[PDB]
């Protein structure tokens, strides 16, 4: 069950998909960065498609819906990488093994520019950055700490009962950890320049 | 899509169900275990029935069957844990950033061994507090392998001009296999937990 936006795939099962400048789901992205990044140079937004990493994907989010009893488990952030990861990402998505204060998971930003600093977007020799817009199931989040490995139980009396993510700051977070394959889709690429 | 075998479970996501002596389910597992460790002697066999480890682990396992086209990709292994872990195992399964580091490293992952006498030792199934040990019984996708390394987070490229298209899990040795080794969530499915006794 692959999405409306998703462009013909010819029977295949990954292809990154550069997005007409100008267009309805080019500029939805756009705004999202410019919100924070207004002052770098957007060079080009691709859609990742790739079917297994999204049926992996969907399957946590309808686990997760019934778990929580609502939607609103699903947030958009940001992660910014070095152009050497970017392959292995678009294929395998975000992996846990590969600044840990809040836990040993894979962080994502609220904000673009947080993304944007050079220590997460390493410039390539040629200047461009690499930040994904990420699809993630937060779901129902506390304050983390270092050295978790999974997010906590939220009841100490039920100990395998656990949080879905944690956060910075709960009332209002800037970033999110989550600490289990499948939890995060690499929705867009962008490639930008300071 | 749960398997028609199972015990109803009332709109419950998870059971143990505790299986007897003279069903071949429970003879088969009893055969596979007594095959290496005719020394111990099983308390009891529970399947378990957890429906989402199930669904994401049969979701990957489809994913493995297309890519690899032809293969059996799924072996049934064993795994010894201490009882403080087995709650977690049973709901949430197998998670490589609590592995113990292995006496012979192959990776940085969860193993899985072929034969019950390995996953016996008490460095692995460690004799609770009552004299009881913890061993279960796994579907792990095992997919295309290669011998490991001890600095494997994930394992190796088939092919190092194209560092992203990966073996499935690693072993010991390719020729005998005896362990198996995998990076990834949903890649194993614990099945069976032998409680067992000297
Ligand atoms: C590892 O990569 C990141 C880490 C991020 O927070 C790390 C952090 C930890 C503790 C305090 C603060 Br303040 C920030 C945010 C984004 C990315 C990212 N790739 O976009």
């Not at 609103?72 to 998505?93: C, I, K, M």
């Not at 970033?175 to 930008?192: G, K, S, W």
């Amino acid at each position: 069950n692959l999405p409306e936006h998703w462009t013909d795939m010819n029977h295949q099962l990954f292809c990154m998909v550069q997005l007409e400048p100008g267009q309805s789901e080019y500029n939805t992205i756009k705004d999202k960065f410019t919100r924070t990044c207004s002052s770098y140079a957007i060079e080009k937004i691709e859609r990742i498609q790739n079917a297994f990493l999204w049926q992996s994907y969907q399957v946590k989010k309808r686990q997760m819906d019934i778990k929580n009893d609502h939607k609103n488990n699903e947030r958009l952030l940001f992660h910014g990488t070095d152009a050497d990861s970017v392959p292995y990402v678009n294929q395998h998505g975000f992996n846990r093994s590969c600044a840990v204060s809040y836990g040993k998971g894979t962080y994502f930003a609220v904000d673009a520019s947080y993304s944007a600093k050079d220590t997460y977007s390493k410039p390539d020799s040629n200047g461009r950055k690499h930040m994904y817009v990420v699809r993630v199931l937060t779901g129902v989040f506390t304050k983390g700490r270092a050295g978790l490995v999974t997010p906590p139980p939220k009841n100490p009396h039920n100990p395998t009962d656990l949080f879905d993510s944690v956060t910075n700051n709960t009332r209002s977070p800037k970033l999110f950890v989550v600490f289990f394959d499948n939890q995060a889709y690499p929705e867009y690429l962008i490639t930008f320049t300071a």
